[PDB]
Structures are given as structure tokens and as C-alpha cells.
Design goal:
The complex is a heterotetramer, with 2 copies of chain A (137 residues) and 2 copies of chain B (146 residues).
Chain A (H helix, E strand, L loop, with lengths): L2 H12 L5 H15 L17 H19 L4 H4 L1 H11 L3 H18 L6 H18 L2
Chain B lengths: L4 H11 L7 H12 L16 H5 L2 H18 L5 H4 L1 H10 L5 H18 L5 H18 L5
Classes of the chains: A mainly alpha (137), B mainly alpha (146).
The complex binds protoporphyrin IX containing FE (HEM) (4 copies).
């Protein structure tokens, strides 16, 4: 991430605020519906619409991204326990980080049109791919 | 490969509202900005050196109109996407040597553009229907590799 | 998948020498070691927590024999892979929900295993023919996603 | 790369030793035959078997990998000239790095029977993916 990418991500993700749980849950729902293969990571969840488990998990995913934005120059440290969880314990397929990242971009585009310019789209894509690299390492 | 009536309703309800003069250029432009290696295929299009240069580039807009028209043609022939895209598959695969991963990427950029334009109307179920479509288009365009 | 008669002879001559009780387990084991998310689909196989646990696991070996047998059946009819993989595609796509990228990865691991076993005999042209085969198998296994 | 990955890569590449240039050239030949689309990046090359141009280029690729192995903790710096070349000037599709990486693994498997164990295979895969990340950044 360049300084320009970091500036773009902080501005755009700053707009999320108290919507973190709602947007995170929406991104998860987009992923589960669009790419049903990703559901094999959540057999222990109720994944139906309006699920409280998806809502609570969506807030964790979004809050983790907020912390990553706050520590964008040292994301390996900021995501280290979650890297152990995803890469070592759960063994999440790297393809699925691409799918969730796409669904996060779709959610942000649908809720923050003015912020989702082509340049900010590119910066957010790079940010999420960087997060994904840490979580798969 | 097969859309249910719910998925077909999702796609058709939205597609009539799509600005066919603009959305293709927006998707192609964002592809070139977000995935800059794709610019290798469009050297003849001129200035692609910045996001504003790409998005304002008349050849990007004009070509995007053709790309979207091919997507529209696929939407009119969902049960024969392979035959709808056979000539384009020969062009992209045998002639231009575009790796088919990029077909997936452009389909997903188009989905982002639809979300950006339509907001809350582009619900998770509507997106899921469009993902089946763009995956079907990508697979059809890749057929000459298969 | 279409091989020329020269390519077909090269592929089949090598395949006759493949230890079908071992090579499948080696390819499957290396898939589970090199790409550990694939382990999630084989939880019932027991201990997969270290490379030596995976490579020595009797269920990995036995299952790898079945995998190799399907590659063998596919080699017998490369021009109509649907004739060997139509039901296996329903299993992997509709029932197990394996991401199809992993079909490509397993095919490439199998190519690595063949190179490991055959050394200089696994020439660039022999590899190229096997790449056509494993790409066709992966594409056939993914048919129920298309 | 973990310490175990680095240890495995340094050990394996030590066994490669003075054969690195030959293995690089062989990997390129395998790539051009197995994935002929990659030939379009080399319009000025003779790409036939035994091409001195392919041989010479494989030795350059091998030298870069050897430097990366020697500087495995600082690969962005060690490979810095190559990122601009591959990402900006040539605009090499990221998928093609996976193709060359696979052909390098095939070459190493064909020449290093004892050293190309499953664990070392895994470490070398991650190493080549790490190199690829630098060249596409
Ligand atoms: C941007 C990428 C991601 C972020 C930031 C993220 C974040 C998180 C966090 C913070 C947790 C901890 C939950 C807790 O402690 O209660 C978690 C758990 C989990 N993640 Fe992710 N995740 C990401 C991608 C993925 C993907 C792509 C998958 C699979 C498709 C996945 C599958 C899971 C699972 C199965 C759990 C355990 C849930 C539970 O049992 O409570 N994650 N993730
Ligand atoms: C995935 C959906 C895609 C569709 C429906 C599509 C459609 C088309 C169409 C309709 C044409 C015009 C053909 C003609 O006028 O004869 C075209 C040309 C072209 N496409 Fe695509 N395309 C897609 C993806 C891509 C991608 C991902 C790339 C490269 C990254 C690409 C690169 C090109 C190029 C270089 C041309 C020729 C440009 C020219 O002649 O000026 N296409 N495509
Ligand atoms: C790409 C080449 C592949 C081939 C040729 C292949 C072949 C087979 C065959 C012949 C069976 C036995 C089916 C039966 O007895 O009904 C099977 C089962 C299975 N395969 Fe595959 N497979 C491939 C890839 C994969 C991959 C990549 C995964 C997971 C990452 C996978 C996971 C499974 C599982 C979980 C089963 C069921 C095992 C059980 O019953 O416990 N396969 N496969
Ligand atoms: C491990 C991955 C790779 C490494 C270490 C590598 C390394 C190198 C090196 C050292 C050079 C010479 C730099 C110079 O002479 O100034 C070079 C040039 C080049 N590479 Fe790569 N490369 C890699 C992957 C690729 C791939 C995947 C492609 C395309 C499929 C590619 C295409 C080229 C081309 C076209 C040139 C310029 C050739 C010429 O015009 O003389 N490289 N690379």
C-alpha cells in the first residue's frame, strides 16, 4: 500500500462507522449466496437471512478490518492471531478471501457511492488483498 | 448454467434499467485501473496513465459499450451462452491470448459497477443471480481453452 | 481433451509404469500438505497435522488409489471426459462443494509427482501432454458448476 | 516464509547449486510448451528447443532466484529492479507467475528426487509465490 492507498482506505472505511456490523453481515450474506462453496466453513452457523450469528460474526469481521486500517503499515502484527486462526487452525482456502473481498467491495459500493471512485476502488482492492495475504500466511 | 425464475426475475428487473451507453465503459475502465496488467491488451487505446485518464478515455467508453452489448446478448440467450460467445471465445483465446481469469475479474467489476449505481436495490440475492450470469459468460468465453 | 497420436503414445507409455497403489496417495498427500485447506474435506481420515502423518495415513493412500483410477479411466477416453466424470462432478460440486481451483491444484501436484518419479523421462513434451490431460480432468470435474 | 520454510529453501537451493541456470532454462522451456500463451511476452525470442536465447534468459531468472534465496528476509529490496520490469513495463499477468512457478517445481522435482520431499515442496511453493508477489507489486 502506498500512502495514497492508505489515505484512500482510511477515508472510505472511516465512512463505515457504526454500520460495521450491518455491512460486515451483508458482505458475508453476499458471499454465502453468490458463492455457496464458502458455506463449508460455517456448518456450525445458522446462515439463514437475518441470522443473529451472521450479524455477530459480521461485526467481528468488520471491526477486525477497522483495526487493520488503524495499523495499515504493520498489518502482520495487527492480524497475527487471526492469521493463526485462518491459516493454521481453520485452513481457509485463499480463493475464499478473494470471494469475501469482492463481496466487501460490493457492499461498500452499494452503501457509499460517492466514496467508491475508481481510485478508491483500486486502493480498497489492494487493502483487502493485503489483509488476505496476511490471513493466509 | 440454469437460472431459476427467482434469479431470472432479479436479472431482468435490473437490466432494463442499466444505462447501456455508460455502464460498460465504467466496468472496463475500472478493470484497467484496478488490475493494471489488463492494460497490456489495450495499448491502442491511448492514455491510460491515471484513473481519470482511463475513465475519460473515449476508446474505453466506446469499447465498453461493445462489451456490455455482448453481456446483453448473453442475457437474451442464457440457455446457449456457449454458442452465443463462440466467436468471441476464438478471438480472446486463440487471437488475443487473454488469460480466462481476467474474464472472471471483469464480470466481478461489472457486478461492482451495478452495485455502485443501484445501491440498496442491488441486494445480496440480486447479486447472487448476476454472479451466476457473469460466471456463465466467463466460462463461455473460455470455451476455446477447454 | 485431444492428444495427437504421438502425444497419446508418450502419455500412455509413461502411465503404464506408474505405481497405481502409491502415486495417487503421493499426489493426494502432497495436495493436503502443500495446500492444507484441502484437509478440511478429509477430516474423517484421521491425523493430517504433519507431513509425515499425511503421507503415511492409510486412508490417504487408499483414497489416492481411487483418485488415480479415475485419472486412468479418463485417459482411456480423453475425447469425452464427461463419460468418466459426470457423476464424480455431481459428487464434488453439488455434494462436497469443493472449490474447482483445487481440481487444478491436484492435477498440477500429480504432474509434480510424475516428474519426481520419472526424472529425465518426464520431458518437456511429455509434461505438456500431461498438462492437457489434467486440465481436461479439472474442467470435467467442474462441469456441475458451469 | 517461516524459519522452517527459509531453512528448507536454503537447503534445497544449495543442492541446486551450480545447476540453477540449467534448471531455470528448463523451466522456461516447459512453460513455453505447456502454456504456449506465455510465449507472447517474448516476441523477439527464438523459442525453439535448444534456443540460446531461452537458455540465456533461464540463467538470468536463476540468478535472480539465487539472490532472492540469499536475501530471503528482504526480497522486495533484493528483487526491486524486477518489479518495475514485470509489473509496469511488461505487464505480466499474475496468473503466468503461477505457471512459471509450477514449471520450476516440476523441474526441481525431476532433478532433485531426494530433496523434493512434501515439506520442501511446500516451502518452495511458498517461496516462489513470495517472489511472484514482489514481481507483481
Ligand atoms: C477480510 C477477511 C477476513 C477477516 C477480517 C476475518 C475476520 C475474522 C475474525 C475477527 C474472526 C474471529 C471470530 C471470533 O473470535 O469470534 C474470524 C473467524 C472465522 N473466520 Fe474469518 N475473516 C476473514 C475471512 C474469512 C473467510 C474468507 C472465511 C471462509 C470463507 C473465514 C472463516 C472464518 C471462520 C469459519 C471463523 C470462525 C467463526 C466462529 O467459529 O465463530 N474468514 N474471522
Ligand atoms: C468477460 C467478458 C468480456 C466480454 C463479453 C468481451 C467482449 C468483447 C467484444 C464484444 C469485443 C469486440 C469484438 C469485435 O468487435 O470483433 C471484444 C474485444 C476485445 N476484448 Fe473483450 N470481452 C470480455 C473480456 C475481456 C477481457 C477480460 C480482456 C482483457 C483483459 C478483453 C480484451 C479484449 C481486447 C484486447 C479486444 C480487442 C480490442 C480491439 O479490437 O480494439 N476482453 N471483447
Ligand atoms: C481433480 C481430480 C480429482 C479426482 C480425479 C477425484 C476423484 C475422486 C474419486 C474417484 C472419488 C471416489 C468417489 C466415490 O467413491 O463415490 C473421490 C471422492 C472424494 N474426493 Fe475427489 N477427486 C479429485 C479432486 C478432489 C479434490 C481437489 C478434493 C478436495 C480438496 C476432493 C475431495 C474428495 C472427497 C472429500 C471425496 C469423498 C471421500 C470420502 O468419501 O470420504 N477431490 N474423488
Ligand atoms: C520467478 C519468476 C520470475 C523471475 C525471477 C524473473 C526474472 C527475470 C529477470 C532476472 C529478467 C532479466 C532482467 C533484465 O535483464 O534486466 C527478466 C526479464 C523478463 N521476464 Fe521475467 N522473471 C520471472 C517471471 C516471469 C514470467 C512469469 C514472465 C512471463 C510469462 C516473464 C517474462 C519476462 C520477460 C518478457 C522479460 C524480458 C525479456 C526480454 O525482453 O529480454 N518473467 N525476468
Amino acid at each position: 500500500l502506498s500512502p495514497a492507498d492508505k489515505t484512500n482506505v482510511k477515508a472510505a472505511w472511516g465512512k463505515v462507522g457504526a454500520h460495521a456490523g450491518e455491512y460486515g453481515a451483508e458482505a458475508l450474506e453476499r458471499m454465502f449466496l453468490s458463492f455457496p462453496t464458502t458455506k463449508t466453513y460455517f456448518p456450525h452457523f445458522d446462515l439463514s437471512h437475518g441470522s443473529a450469528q451472521v450479524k455477530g460474526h459480521g461485526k467481528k469481521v468488520a471491526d477486525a478490518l477497522t483495526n487493520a486500517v488503524a495499523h495499515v503499515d504493520d498489518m502482520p502484527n495487527a492480524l497475527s492471531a487471526l492469521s493463526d486462526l485462518h491459516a493454521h487452525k481453520l485452513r481457509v482456502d485463499p480463493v475464499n478471501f478473494k470471494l469475501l473481498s469482492h463481496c466487501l467491495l460490493v457492499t461498500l459500493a452499494a452503501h457509499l457511492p460517492a466514496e467508491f471512485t475508481p481510485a478508491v476502488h483500486a486502493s480498497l482492492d489492494k487493502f483487502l488483498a493485503s489483509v488476505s495475504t496476511v490471513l493466509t500466511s | 448454467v440454469h437460472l431459476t425464475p427467482e434469479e431470472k426475475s432479479a436479472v431482468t428487473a435490473l437490466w432494463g434499467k442499466v444505462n447501456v451507453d455508460e455502464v460498460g465503459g465504467e466496468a472496463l475502465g475500472r478493470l484497467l485501473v484496478v488490475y493494471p496488467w489488463t492494460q497490456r491488451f489495450f495499448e491502442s487505446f491511448g492514455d491510460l496513465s491515471t484513473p481519470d485518464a482511463v475513465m475519460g478515455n473515449p476508446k474505453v467508453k466506446a469499447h465498453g459499450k461493445k462489451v456490455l452489448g455482448a453481456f446483453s446478448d448473453g442475457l437474451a440467450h442464457l440457455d446457449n451462452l456457449k454458442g452465443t460467445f463462440a466467436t468471441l471465445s476464438e478471438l480472446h483465446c486463440d487471437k488475443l491470448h487473454v488469460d480466462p481469469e481476467n474474464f472472471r475479474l471483469l464480470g466481478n467489476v461489472l457486478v461492482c459497477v451495478l452495485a455502485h449505481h443501484f445501491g440498496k436495490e442491488f441486494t445480496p440475492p440480486v447479486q447472487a443471480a448476476y454472479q451466476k450470469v457473469v460466471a456463465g459468460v466467463a466460462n463461455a468465453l473460455a470455451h476455446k481453452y477447454h
